[PDB]
Amino acid sequence: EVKILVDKDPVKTSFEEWAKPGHFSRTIAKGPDTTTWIWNLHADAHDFDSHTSDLEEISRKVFSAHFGQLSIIFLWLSGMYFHGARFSNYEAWLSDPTHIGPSAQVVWPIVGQEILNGDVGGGFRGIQITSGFFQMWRASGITSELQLYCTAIGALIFAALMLFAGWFHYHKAAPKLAWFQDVESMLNHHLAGLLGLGSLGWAGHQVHVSLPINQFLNAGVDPKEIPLPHEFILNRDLLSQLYPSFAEGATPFFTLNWSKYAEFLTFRGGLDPVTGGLWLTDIAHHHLAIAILFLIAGHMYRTNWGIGHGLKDILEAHKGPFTGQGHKGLYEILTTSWHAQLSLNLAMLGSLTIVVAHHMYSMPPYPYLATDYGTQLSLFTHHMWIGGFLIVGAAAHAAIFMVRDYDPTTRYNDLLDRVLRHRDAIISHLNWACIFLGFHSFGLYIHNDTMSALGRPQDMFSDTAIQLQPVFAQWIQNTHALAPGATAPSATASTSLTWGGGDLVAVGGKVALLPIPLGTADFLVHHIHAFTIHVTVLILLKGVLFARSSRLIPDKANLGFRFPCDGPGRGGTCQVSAWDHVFLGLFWMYNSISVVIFHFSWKMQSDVWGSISDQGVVTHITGGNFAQSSITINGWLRDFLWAQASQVIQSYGSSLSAYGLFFLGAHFVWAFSLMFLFSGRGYWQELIESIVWAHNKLKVAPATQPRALSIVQGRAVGVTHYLLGGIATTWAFFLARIIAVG
Amino acid sequence: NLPSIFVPLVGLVFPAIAMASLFLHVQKN
Amino acid sequence: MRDLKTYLSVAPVLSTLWFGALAGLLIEINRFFPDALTFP
Amino acid sequence: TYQVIQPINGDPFIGSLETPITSSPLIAWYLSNLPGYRTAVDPLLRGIEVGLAHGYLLVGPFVITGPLRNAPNHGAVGSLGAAGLIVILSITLTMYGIASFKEGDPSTAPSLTLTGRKKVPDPLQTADGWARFTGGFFFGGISGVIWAYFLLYVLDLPYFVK
Amino acid sequence: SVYFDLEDIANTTGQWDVYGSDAPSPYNGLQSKFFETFAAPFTKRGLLLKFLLLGGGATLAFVSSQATGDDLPIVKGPQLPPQPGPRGKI
Amino acid sequence: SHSVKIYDTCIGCTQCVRACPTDVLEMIPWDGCKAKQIASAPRTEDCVGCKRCESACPTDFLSVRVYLWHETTRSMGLAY
Amino acid sequence: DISGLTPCKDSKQFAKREKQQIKKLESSLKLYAPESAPALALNAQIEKTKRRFDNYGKYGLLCGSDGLPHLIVNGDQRHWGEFITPGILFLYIAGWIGWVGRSYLIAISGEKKPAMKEIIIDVPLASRIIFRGFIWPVAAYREFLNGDLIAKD
Amino acid sequence: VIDYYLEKSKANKELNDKKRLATTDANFARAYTVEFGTCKFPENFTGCQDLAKQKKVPFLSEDLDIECEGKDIYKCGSNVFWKW
Ligand code: CLA
Ligand code: CLA
Ligand code: CLA
Ligand code: CLA
Ligand code: CLA
Ligand code: CLA
């Protein structure tokens, strides 16, 4: 039976364990003898399953940690709304969004730093923001600074609520293990309750507060004379003028005359020409349909009454001649291992973030977002990085599950067993695929570079030379462009302007979107992307599959998930643990995402973004140089890296001077990481031995004996600094370029 | 005159002969 | 009370308090005595 | 129930598996009828067949993708390049044979079938057998290159891509 | 039921010929006689290596020496007046 | 084959022997320590050189020393 | 003057730099109402620049052929305010810090587990020690004579 | 109706522009109060916003005064109270 199960006062609230560092583990609680202890305290802080073997005790800890994270997120949102209300030019940007740059940060006049308050327009000095909050606030119907202050106060109250909830559910009412393992109820509530009701409420807000205020805004009326949102609920007459169908009330809904609501519930496609974003009437209908779909979906599983499905029943009925018993045993694995669930959820969330990034640029949902290039580039890059990091974490935690929670004697599964019985075939095939893709993707660039350097432009792989046309993607584009006429007759326009419908949307003399052409250069970059993705997959999958054992190390599981090596024997056994494989795969994820964002930036600046005059002529930022220059490595070096870095390197003495400083700092940190990556701790411990002598000579030697960083810790520091420096270099370069020229 | 004959010899033929001889040497016994 | 005072004496908390006080002192000195290249 | 994948030859401790890709009767027959697996026949004829196939297949890429592809002399130049590649491959085969096989040593091929029946090991894994194989390969490859050239640019048959 | 025999180590370790065929020669007798007659000189591995290396080198040198300006731009040579240097150097 | 040597600073706690992944070391009777036993390495041809014994050595300095020497198919941990 | 440099009160490049900075600041002033807060903030920056340049003139700094102040370190008695006096003040503060650290490390050395007072600091003991750095030169000298400074191993 | 609120905005363009300028100027000067000398040590015991309605600080009071003007009792979107 599904019911609330709690335990009263399991852990006493006291400050006594705050004064004892390392209380959570047996080894660390004894106090430090060397400096390694100081690091070991921070590396094992959230490794709950290593603190205790009780599943219930671990689950309560993660449940409260989630509340803490939610409180932190609410504090962050409250700060964003408060800075929008108190230190921003939002109200001026509302009346002129095409000529005023959003800004919500103002610096103090100290040590000359007040130069960063640049001319963003609207009689305001500040730092231009690229988060896109202004367009979201305009879409939501927010018109005054007072409504942002109330949102900040509400977010503060909610953060306090989540913090209190975490304390209450760890110290007063701690749910039992059976409560957490009620997966059917959790799925039902998250599908129907959270998502369905949330989308239904947002749809209600859109049809009641967003649609009318945005209709007034798009009509060209002053924001300060638009009626307040509640005025559209009090006298329905105001709502019966923009849309006369509201005069009918809810009678059409209950009598199944839904076409009567076609005024504010539409299937249009394309973009709003005044706005440059998706029609709000389309978005409200989308959310209303998603609400019904999720509310019906959240009724699939059986909780307490007979109707519904059993997850174990579905899993045990899917087996075949090639897969033995099939999925039997997976319910036991996924209801007793936090790490497997974390791995699956991380992979799905990281994959979904990339889809969000891809969909937000091609279908701009927010008003005046498409013509704000700095916001678009920043959002795309940010979500790509988030997705890549989450995907890497998925592999890390799958390896952790394999090392710790895998047990064929009590939790056997045929599919996992059969995967482990032919891992050599999987890994060798992926190796061959990676080599083939690397050759037939990157060596074409080398061929083009050599042909260009040899004075033979006619022997290259180019649109004016040997062609490699992406015919399949071109066919998909043509099919999607013809959808409104044959395959989506009720739709008026295609789902995106990039499919090829031969139209361009211009807002404020700036190009929002237009059909994106695909040629040989795109054929090259797409296979480059596939190659890097395959190599990252190879590195991570090899670590997951070979974590327990290999022909080199028959007993790799006893060494743990995170160990440096197994000695210099067998020729050398460095970086054989599953942790190292994640450490190596982080670099390749970084490489892949960097290439993807470089591709996006160059393509958008060359073939989509630009300006349009009152003659009908389009002039792009880099003038369509992608097709003929992005086919050689020298082209990327010269026309992209050298040409577009001219902004960040001449930003000194302007409001963009903080990006050149961050450019240099990121370069410095990236170089700094190579000291940790290229060396080892045996040299550093010996070097420390001499400094300890100098300290002992002057009686200043500390009792906590200085130790060089551990073998694994040095790798972590090196990779963290490498990633930080690399990502910050592009952050500064992209922001400076797209703010100066965009 | 000479370069058209000498360049293929030094760049292709001599490396091939040397590689064959060295491979047969290192694979002995 | 005693345990909380013990916790506030831990290295990171004392470090952030000390460096915050130092940063405030230096910031105020630079606010009231800006652009100092020499010592008159 | 009924499982498809089985251990190789019924032995679960040999590092392989029996899959439809590896053990289906069609693929087994096809692999058994290739010249590389015809154990009981002179390796020279097998090398002749292998060279005839490979030199013939090598003509196209050199002729069509080469630097002189747009010249009127493209066919002969590409055929010469294919012949040079065949010569290099024969050199590599001779090097491998000299490095791998001593004159007096017997064959290194297995002497058992999958059913455990004793057979005569393949003479291709001997010095003389490999020498005959590489000689046949050279002779077949040159002839295949010449035949492809004769079909494409001496009779000028209406091939779609030339 | 057992896959370990000390008298049969080849069977135990999997020394099998999977796709090897013991079938007789599928080739015609006259064709085999022709190929045996006309490919015999190339079956001496010591002679074949020396012949291939030396003859291939000589053929490569000869072909490179017989190439015309139409085949190789390097043989054609420059056809345009030379460009001057940055500060008047020739 | 690598070289494994034992010095008389041994205290005979048998930590190296049970850390051997290839059964190279063993314990033999002795009279130089209270435990009346010392380690020996009679099967260094199976040594891989992972130095797991030295990680289990309590003596300062080490009483068991591994020197990486000529490489064989056994010492490189090759199964192919 | 020294090394061919001219005083910044005489050099025309210094005045030209000051004029160009004010002109750069005054160009952004045109985009705002004469009474607005950004106009009041740029005016404060203009006064700050004027005061900075006037101070650099008054202190008697030497400027090169670029209009920028140049420091003189060799020991000239009319340039002690650029390296010598600030260096002495730094050496007084750093010695203070080092001596207070050394005394605290010595004070906790003779305990049961002295590594716990290195991660959880005994704040009263530190308060006792801290103000002993005001006379750090005298004590540092005096343990040099007696021999309580250097461990003779 | 749209073309009635367009008429309303036509007659009040200058007034709304003066609201925008004031509200952005106050937002910028909130970071410069201390340097200006308006809201500092002896009078910032509460917020400079609180001091804006009891001391008439130069820039944070113009926004307060102009914020609602020509608006009805319960129809100013920038002040819940306005004319209570
Ligand atoms: C993620 C959330 C977030 C972020 C990044 C920021 C960031 C910022 N806010 Mg902000 N804010 C937030 C949430 C956030 N806020 C929320 C939720 C609210 C509503 C309550 C506000 C309300 C708010 C106001 C009202 C103001 C800012 C301001 C600022 C800016 C300067 C802050 C500063 O110097 O701190 C001030 C310094 C400290 C708080 C000290 C740090 C304290 C730590 C613990 C160290 C303590 C050591 C101490 C200083 C030493 C002395 C101790 C003593 C014992 C001797 C900065 C950009 C200011 C601004 O932009 O001015 C133009 C400003 O006026 N914020
Ligand atoms: C319709 C019911 C409902 C709803 C709305 C939620 C919503 C949520 N659950 Mg949840 N849950 C439910 C039923 C529900 N659950 C049931 C029946 C079970 C038992 C099977 C669980 C077991 C469960 C676990 C084990 C965990 C969650 C977590 C979460 C959060 C995921 C993070 C997120 O998306 O942030 C979205 C954020 C918001 C929408 C902000 C608003 C916050 C909402 C409104 C508070 C939810 C109140 C709750 C439903 C009832 C309160 C009790 C009452 C006495 C006050 C989210 C707030 C995770 C989490 O983060 O824990 C804190 C987590 O680890 N849930
Ligand atoms: C919701 C996601 C999530 C969750 C709950 C966890 C949870 C966990 N992970 Mg995990 N992980 C994640 C995402 C997640 N991870 C992702 C996305 C990756 C890929 C990068 C990894 C990679 C990873 C590895 C490789 C390992 C873990 C480990 C662990 C466990 C111990 C964590 C710990 O003690 O850290 C303690 C926290 C710290 C030491 C703080 C580190 C601070 C980082 C490095 C700095 C980040 C830079 C920052 C953003 C910039 C600041 C600038 C600076 C100037 C201020 C714990 C169960 C470890 C383990 O043993 O698992 C059992 C382990 O070895 N994870
Ligand atoms: C630019 C530097 C660089 C390059 C070229 C490579 C190349 C490669 N890495 Mg790699 N790697 C690098 C830096 C680099 N790495 C760094 C810095 C790290 C640390 C994070 C790693 C970490 C790493 C891991 C962890 C893995 C790789 C893998 C691979 C291979 C992928 C397969 C492939 O593309 O083969 C194609 C080969 C190339 C693209 C190389 C260029 C060849 C071009 C076409 C020229 C060749 C012309 C011709 C042959 C020249 C002959 C002339 C004659 C005179 C000799 C490939 C050999 C993976 C692997 O082995 O999978 C198979 C793998 O698992 N690398
Ligand atoms: C110094 C070294 C060297 C030299 C001299 C050459 C010379 C040549 N290369 Mg080359 N190459 C080299 C290094 C070298 N390569 C390296 C290191 C690489 C790897 C990056 C390449 C990759 C490369 C490619 C990918 C291609 C060439 C091609 C060519 C030819 C271009 C001329 C032409 O258009 O006629 C074209 C003329 C023909 C196609 C007919 C050639 C017929 C020959 C002369 C028959 C004789 C072969 C002989 C029997 C074999 C001797 C082998 C030796 C071991 C004994 C020319 C013969 C191109 C070509 O077409 O050559 C096949 C070509 O596509 N090269
Ligand atoms: C009690 C504090 C103390 C004292 C007196 C010294 C003294 C010395 N150190 Mg040293 N050091 C310290 C802390 C200290 N160190 C710490 C914490 C670190 C780790 C970052 C180092 C790392 C270090 C290195 C790597 C080297 C020295 C060297 C030296 C010698 C030359 C001076 C020098 O290069 O200074 C430079 C000093 C530093 C870079 C570190 C200073 C760190 C801060 C300022 C000290 C703070 C101490 C503590 C937190 C405050 C106590 C508070 C207490 C009252 C509660 C000198 C004997 C050098 C040497 O042996 O050559 C002879 C040398 O190469 N030190």
Curated annotation (Swiss-Prot), chain C:
Domain of life: Eukaryota
Gene Ontology cellular-component terms listed: chloroplast thylakoid membrane; photosystem I
Record's keyword terms, sorted: Chloroplast, Membrane, Photosynthesis, Photosystem I, Plastid, Thylakoid, Transmembrane, Transmembrane helix
Membrane topology: Single-pass membrane protein
Gene Ontology BP terms: photosynthesis
Membrane spanning residue stretches: 7-27
Subcellular location field: Plastid, Chloroplast thylakoid membrane
Family annotation (PANTHER family): PHOTOSYSTEM I REACTION CENTER SUBUNIT IX, PTHR36082
Function: May help in the organization of the PsaE and PsaF subunits.
Classification via HAMAP family: PSI_PsaJ
Family, as annotated: Belongs to the PsaJ family.
Protein name listed in UniProt: Photosystem I reaction center subunit IX
Gene name per UniProt: psaJ
Swiss-Prot record, chain F:
GO molecular function terms noted in the UniProt entry: 4 iron, 4 sulfur cluster binding; electron transfer activity; metal ion binding; oxidoreductase activity
Pfam families xrefs: Fer4_21
Required cofactor(s): [4Fe-4S] cluster
Domain 4Fe-4S ferredoxin-type: 1-30, 38-67
UniProt KW DNA-binding keyword: no
Keyword terms: 4Fe-4S, Chloroplast, Electron transport, Iron, Iron-sulfur, Membrane, Metal-binding, Oxidoreductase, Photosynthesis, Photosystem I, Plastid, Repeat, Thylakoid, Transport
Biological process terms in GO annotation: photosynthetic electron transport in photosystem I
Gene3D superfamilies xrefs: 3.30.70.20
UniProt subcellular location: Plastid, Chloroplast thylakoid membrane
EC top class named in words: oxidoreductase
One annotated Gene Ontology cellular component of this protein: chloroplast thylakoid membrane
EC number: 1.97.1.12
Membrane topology term: Peripheral membrane protein
InterPro entries for the chain: 4Fe4S_Fe-S-bd, 4Fe4S_Fe_S_CS, PSI_iron-sulfur_center, PSI_PsaC
Cofactor binding note from Swiss-Prot or TrEMBL: Binds 2 [4Fe-4S] clusters. Cluster 2 is most probably the spectroscopically characterized electron acceptor FA and cluster 1 is most probably FB.
Catalytic activity entry: reduced [plastocyanin] + hnu + oxidized [2Fe-2S]-[ferredoxin] = oxidized [plastocyanin] + reduced [2Fe-2S]-[ferredoxin]
Residue sites binding [4Fe-4S] cluster 1 per the record: 10, 13, 16, 57
Binding site for [4Fe-4S] cluster 2: 20, 47, 50, 53
Subunit structure as annotated in this protein's UniProt entry: The eukaryotic PSI reaction center is composed of at least 11 subunits.
Function field: Apoprotein for the two 4Fe-4S centers FA and FB of photosystem I (PSI); essential for photochemical activity. FB is the terminal electron acceptor of PSI, donating electrons to ferredoxin. The C-terminus interacts with PsaA/B/D and helps assemble the protein into the PSI complex. Required for binding of PsaD and PsaE to PSI. PSI is a plastocyanin-ferredoxin oxidoreductase, converting photonic excitation into a charge separation, which transfers an electron from the donor P700 chlorophyll pair to the spectroscopically characterized acceptors A0, A1, FX, FA and FB in turn.
UniProt name for this protein: Photosystem I iron-sulfur center
Name of encoding gene: psaC
UniProtKB/Swiss-Prot annotation, chain G:
Membrane recorded as keyword: yes
UniProt GO MF annotations: mRNA binding; protein domain specific binding
Transmembrane segments: 80-100
Source organism phylogeny: Eukaryota, Viridiplantae, Streptophyta, Embryophyta, Tracheophyta
Note: Plants lacking PSAF have altered thylakoid structure and are not viable.
GO process annotations (BP): photosynthesis
Family per similarity comment: Belongs to the PsaF family.
Name this protein carries in UniProt: Photosystem I reaction center subunit III, chloroplastic
Keyword Transmembrane among UniProt keywords: yes
Interval of the full protein contained in this chain: 68 to 220 of 221
Annotated GO CC locations: chloroplast; chloroplast envelope; chloroplast thylakoid; chloroplast thylakoid membrane; nucleus; photosystem I reaction center; plastoglobule; thylakoid
Location(s), subcellular: Plastid, Chloroplast thylakoid membrane
Organism in which the protein naturally occurs: Arabidopsis thaliana (Mouse-ear cress)
The protein's role, per its UniProt record: Participates in efficiency of electron transfer from plastocyanin to P700 (or cytochrome c553 in algae and cyanobacteria). This plastocyanin-docking protein contributes to the specific association of plastocyanin to PSI.
Its membrane topology: Single-pass membrane protein
Keywords: Chloroplast, Membrane, Photosynthesis, Photosystem I, Plastid, Thylakoid, Transit peptide, Transmembrane, Transmembrane helix
